[PDB]
Amino acid sequence: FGNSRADMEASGGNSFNGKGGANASNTFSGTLTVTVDQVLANGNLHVVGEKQIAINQG
Amino acid sequence: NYGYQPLFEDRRPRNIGDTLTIVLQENVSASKSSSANASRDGKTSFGFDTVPRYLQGL
């Protein structure tokens, strides 16, 4: 053990941090009058409708 | 002669040229938003401050 033959010192480190995420949203509010353009075999009604508003510059 | 006119029925437009009051009340509002993120951090280290003799060559 003389002459620092067995003296030793070591250190080590390892680090990892990952993360992730996502999100989506949508809202819609209004009222629209549509018209029936087809009646299906079970009585369900296909409906289509369009509202066009022009206010000033569009 | 203006033809037959119902007595107790509410006054409705029935023929071409009849007038009707439209109360314009429109309130439409739609919105959508989304986001995504991802992160990754990595750190690694190793150090031999004092190396014993039998480990020196390595």
Numbering used by the authors:
A (entry chain B): 117 to 174
B (entry chain A): 59 to 116
Task: Show me the paper's own sentences about this structure.
To obtain the C ring-containing basal body–hook complex in the CW state, we constructed the constitutively active double mutant D13K/Y106W of CheY (hereafter referred to as CheY**), which can mimic CheY-P to tightly bind to the C ring and lock the rotational direction of the motor in the CW state. The density maps of the LP ring, MS ring, rod, hook, and export apparatus in the CW state were locally reconstructed to the higher resolutions ranging from 2.8 Å to 3.8 Å. Although the structures of the LP ring, MS ring, rod, hook, and export apparatus in the CW state are highly similar to those of these components in the CCW state, the protomers of the C ring in the CW state notably undergo inclination and compaction, suggesting that the binding of CheY** induces significant conformational changes of the C ring for rotational switching. The LP ring acts as a bushing to stabilize the rotation of the rod, which serves as the drive shaft.
The bacterial flagellar motor is a huge bidirectional rotary nanomachine that drives rotation of the flagellum for bacterial motility. The cytoplasmic C ring of the flagellar motor functions as the switch complex for the rotational direction switching from counterclockwise to clockwise. The basal body is made up of the LP ring, MS ring, C ring, rod and export apparatus. Here, we present two high-resolution cryo-electron microscopy structures of the C ring-containing flagellar basal body–hook complex from Salmonella Typhimurium, which are in the default counterclockwise state and in a constitutively active CheY mutant-induced clockwise state, respectively.
